Structures are given as C-alpha cells and as structure tokens.
Design a protein around this ligand. Structure first.
Ligand SMILES: [Mn+2]
Ligand SMILES: [Mn+2]
Ligand SMILES: [Mn+2]
Ligand SMILES: [Mn+2]
Lengths: 196, 198, 197, 197
C-alpha cells in the first residue's frame, strides 16, 4: 500500500511564506486523497490486468495518472521545502545552474516564468535531462508527473495549483512564487541532482 | 472591444452559498484579467493575420482560447446565478430534463458527477445539442468554452476551478456543488434553453 | 495473453471496395504488431504494479492505450465488415437509427462527416450510450478505443488511419468512406446493438 | 493569400529513397489541400475577429493549426531534401551536432527514435533552442508546427505521417527513416541554423 508521507517539519514551519492552513489542508486532505484513490485504483488495475481486460485498464488510466501523479509530485514537493531553507545552492548544483541558465537569478526567472505560465492547474519543474546531461525546466499539467511523462528527473517542483496559494495570495501567483524561494530546501535539491 | 460585464447582483447577494469574497475576487480580478488579455490577444491576432504570419497566429491560440474562453464562461456563469434562484425550472426545460435525464434529481446527480469529475481546473455544463435536439451534459478543461470546443449550446455552467470555492469549501468540492443549487437562476437557464427552440 | 484473430473472410473478399493488399498488411502486419506490443506492455505493467512503481506505470500508459486500443479497435473492425455486407440494417437497429439521426441516409452523412473530420489518425464510431439509452456518434484519435476512453459501447467502427485506405484511395478519404458502406456487416452491428439492451 | 510553393526539384528527384509517386501526391494533393483550407480558414477567422465572435474564433482554431501547420511543415520539408544531399553536414552544424548529441551517428539515432516513436501522425524535428542556444530534438503530433507550438526553430523535419512513406515502405517506418538520410539538404539545414545565431 502507498502511504501519506509525514512532512519533514510542522504545518507552520514555512511561515510566513506559505501559511499553516495551506500546508495543513494540502497535506492532510489534498495529498491524502491522492494516496487513498491511488490505492483503490492500483487494486482495480491489478484485477483488470489479471483478466486481460484492456478496456478496463484503459478506463483506469486517468485515475492512475492523476492520483499516482499527485502522490509522486506532492511527496517530492514536501522534501523540496524547509524552514531552514532559502538562499542559493552550492557546489556542483550551483555551477550546473550557472552553466545551463547563465546565473542563479536567470534560473529563478525561467522557473518562475514556467510556473506562472501554467494555464489552469499544474507544476513548474527544474529537472535533469539524463540523455543531454544537463538541467532543463519544464511545466506539467494537473498532476502529470515529470519523470513519468517526460523522462526528466525531478529536482525541484513548484506546485501552482490554486490550492497551493489562493488562501494567502489570492489570484496573485507571482507573489507566491516570489515568496517560495525563501523556503526551498537546496540541500534536498542538491541530493536529487547528485543522485542522477 | 470586449468589456467586463457588471454582475447582475452585489458581491454578497449569493450568501451564504457562495460568499462575497469569492464573488468579488472572481469578478473584479479573475474575469477582469481575462477580458484585458482577450482584447490584447485579439489585437495581436489582427496584426498576425494581416501579415499572413501563420506561426504567430498559432502561437497566440492558447492565450485566445484561455482568455476568450474565460470571458465567455464567466459571462454566462454570472447570469446563471441569482439571489432569487434555486428550486426547479418549470415548463419545457423541466420536461426536457425529465425526458433526457429521467428526473430533475437525476439530472442534478449527473451534472454534479461531471463537475466533481473534473481533474484539475475546468467546468461542468448543461448544454443543448442542436443536431440531436436534446439536452447534453459535458465537462470542459481549464477555460475551454463549451460551444467553441464542443458545439453544444451552454445553458448552465458550474465553475469548478479551485478559486470558485476554495476560500469557503477548501478541498470539499462536493459541498460547493450541493450549495450552488440554491442560487441557480433557472429563469436565465430557461431563457437560454428556449432560444435553442425558437 | 492476447492473440491475433483470424479475419472472418479472405484478404481479397472485400474487393473492390477495400483491396486485398490493404487488408493483408492491415491484419497480418499492423494489427499483429498491436497484439505483440500489447502483450509486452501488459507484462511490463505487472512488474511495475507489483513493485508500486507508479512512475513506471504512468510511463507505460501511452503504449498500453495505443497497442491495447489498436487490438480492441481492429478486432471489432474486422467483424464489422463483410463480403456479403452493405445495404442497411433492419428492425430495432433501423428504428433507433431513424429515431436518433432522422433516417439512415442522415446517419451515414453524420458518421461519414465524423470520420472525414479526424485530423491525423483515428476512428469514427457509431456507439451506444448506455446512460441515455440511445445511439451516439463519436470520433477517437489514434488508437484510443471508444469504450475505454468515452464509455460508449462500440457498434460500428470506421478506421480512417491512412494505412486503411491510402494504397487504393490515396489522400481521398471521402472516396474510401463512400466505398466502405458497401461492405458494412449490418448483421454484426445489429448483434452488438441488441446486446446493449 | 498563401500559395503552394514549387518544389526545388522534380518529383522523381529523390529516387530511390522517396519515390516519385509519394512526392507527387504529397506535394500536389496533400500539401495543396492545406494551402486551400488555410486560406479559407484565415478568411473565416478574420470575419470572426472583426465581429468580436470569440466562440467562432475558438471553433476555427483546430482548422487553423492543422492546415496552417500543414503549410508550415511541408514548406520546410521540401527545402530540407535534395537530390544532391545526404552524408554529413559540412561546417559548424556538424560541430553543433557533435556537441549536443555526442556524434553524428548518435544524433541520427535520436532523431530516428523521436520519429519512429510518434504514435499516429506527426513529425520528428531537429530544432534550435534560442533561449539555451543549442540544438534540441522534438516530436510534434499531426500538423502542429514546431515553432508555433514549442518555440524551437525548425532546422530539419522528418514527416512520419503514413502518406509520407506507406506506398513504398508499407508499415515499415524505420526503413523510410533509414532511407531519408540519403537526401537531407544540409545546405538548407545549415542556412536555418545560421539564422538562429
Ligand atoms: Mn498540490
Ligand atoms: Mn472561474
Ligand atoms: Mn488500422
Ligand atoms: Mn505530410
């Protein structure tokens, strides 16, 4: 069974950048529902597959991608944030960002733009392209996960579903983006980088 | 020149079903943004058209559908709600709902399902299929408008973007859908329905 | 584990409406590859499932829908054609078609239009809407199958991938559509329809 | 008003790699239809735009992208081929390919894989990313054009619609991909590349 991961910090730990009510709902209600529905969905697919019921498998794909995507994406996101975060990364990851995007600040502008550019629900990502051996920014719709739908290894995700910011920032998504840099866990992003 | 239409009522007219903060933000910020981006996008398209720049015409399509669709969808949505709304339609529209969906309550179950079923942002619609001469439910992603993308004539729209309910109902989209039945402007939906039969 | 069905007729049986070469390639090569890749993908998806590898499950979805759908769609399509086909259906099916589309000619017009209307590869379908209790026309892209992606029960499918007609009709998909009416197996479409009720 | 560009060579100029029948049909009928439908759609769009009819504009988007894209893609494609082509590109373009893909052969493997991997109709592209200042491989579905939908500047396109190869190669798209390398117009790809610096 899939389980809702524990957060690495308390619901209020990312204040004032992301408030406690957003965090609490996001984790204990939103992501919990993805986990719960992915478990059901995986079970039904196992049944369909055992019968070679191809129609049923195909019909189940939206719930698997959405709930499974949601689980993947939110599990990464929590590890990407920290009450002890913010600042800039160091070492090879910082040099990679400079190599690939010109500078840390240009990188932030491009990931901000990809994140602000999502029309509707979705995610902005910093990923690693294994075949090209460099960093790459991508946007993903709804809960479509980065690696599963594009092959890029996720390093840093920014959730731009309205539930992730509306209570606090209302429709002003760029304000949310500006604030989240203050809580990025660059230590985590660097581990993800070094692992691929 | 497209313009932001005034609401037919004050921001707090739909309380307690849809609160005044949702309404004020929804209209004065969200829809407002779509109107201006629509106008600007249209003017960019006229420039691209005049030069036969097909690449630029295609690059502008996401903004035109998103902002155009948003203007269309929200313009209908406000007219679909009323402080004097709720209850059931009468006449031909109710008999069509019965013939097409079995009963009013079954219709509600089916538009609720369509609306709850949207994964991500989008809209639940009751539409009219002009070719088949009957009612039809459909869901649309993001701001993709009903008639522009499916051919169905919009009768009643239910906005299920999180901005439409999160401040009040948080993740619980079904509680928002339960509530909104209390403020549907069946007079407007009936007007839209009869225009299909004129 | 899935396998390639035999055609109900010989490769040349639908001449002159759909030539022999088109049929032979379409069944022995195209559909065969969907079956083979379907088995391969199901086998990968069970390993992924067993390990809770959700990323791998999602990465396999395009192949499962494409090859899965291909096997589903082609399998129905062969049974929907016949050398003894054509004309128009009878009884309850014909009554529904008049009821839902006006008349048989209007129906043909509508399914033709939906088929001609696919931009790129895909299929036009006459289906049954179980919830509404009536016939419904839909188009599906690529190999996306009708029931698995829309819930409609397939009754008659028209393949408008270029491999289904190009050898013979080149780009003129309307000529193909006109011709295929001559080989529609209405006894099969009827059977599929009665089974929905 | 858009027009069908003449080919830079005769219809049998790319024999035996792409046969004359495919070329003639592809240019004189398939591309010509996109030209016509683009003109019509543009004029309908201008009428819609002049009336403030946003529903009408949005309903025309699929025909504009499909036919407009089809015009863009095929116009590039004819210029990307040559009877005097093949081999490896001369100049900076090869050095860029080696930098971005390792070697020419790995580049051919990657564009081949992107092209073979299109499920249904579409295009494989070698593009240039202006933001990153390097080459990038991308696949596009149907006639969605590279620049208009991804921002990448097209350098080399490989049409993998079935009309582009079925008459000759039947379902064996990889055979077509192998053959087309013999007729790439590197002089034209290089012109498009230098235009990106
Ligand atoms: Mn989220
Ligand atoms: Mn809205
Ligand atoms: Mn086929
Ligand atoms: Mn082509």
């Amino acid at each position: 069974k899939h389980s809702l991961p524990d957060l690495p910090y308390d619901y209020g730990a990312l204040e004032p950048h992301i408030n406690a009510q957003i965090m609490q709902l996001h984790h204990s209600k939103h992501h919990a529902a993805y986990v719960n529905n992915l478990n059901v969905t995986e079970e039904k697919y196992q049944e369909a597959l055992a019968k070679g019921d191809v129609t049923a498998q195909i019909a189940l794909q939206p719930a698997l991608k959405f709930n499974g995507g949601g689980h993947i994406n939110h599990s990464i996101f929590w590890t990407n944030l920290s009450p002890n975060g913010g600042g800039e990364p160091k070492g090879e990851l910082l040099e990679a960002i400079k190599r690939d995007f010109g500078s840390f600040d240009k990188f932030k502008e491009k990931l901000t733009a990809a994140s602000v550019g999502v029309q509707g629900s979705g995610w902005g990502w910093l990923g690693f392209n294994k075949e090209r051996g460099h960093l790459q920014i991508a946007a993903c719709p709804n809960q479509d996960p980065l690696q599963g739908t594009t092959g890029l290894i996720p390093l840093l995700g920014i959730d731009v579903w309205e539930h992730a910011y509306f209570l606090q920032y209302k429709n002003v998504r760029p304000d949310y983006l500006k604030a989240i840099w203050n809580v990025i866990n660059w230590e985590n992003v660097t581990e993800r980088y070094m692992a691929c």
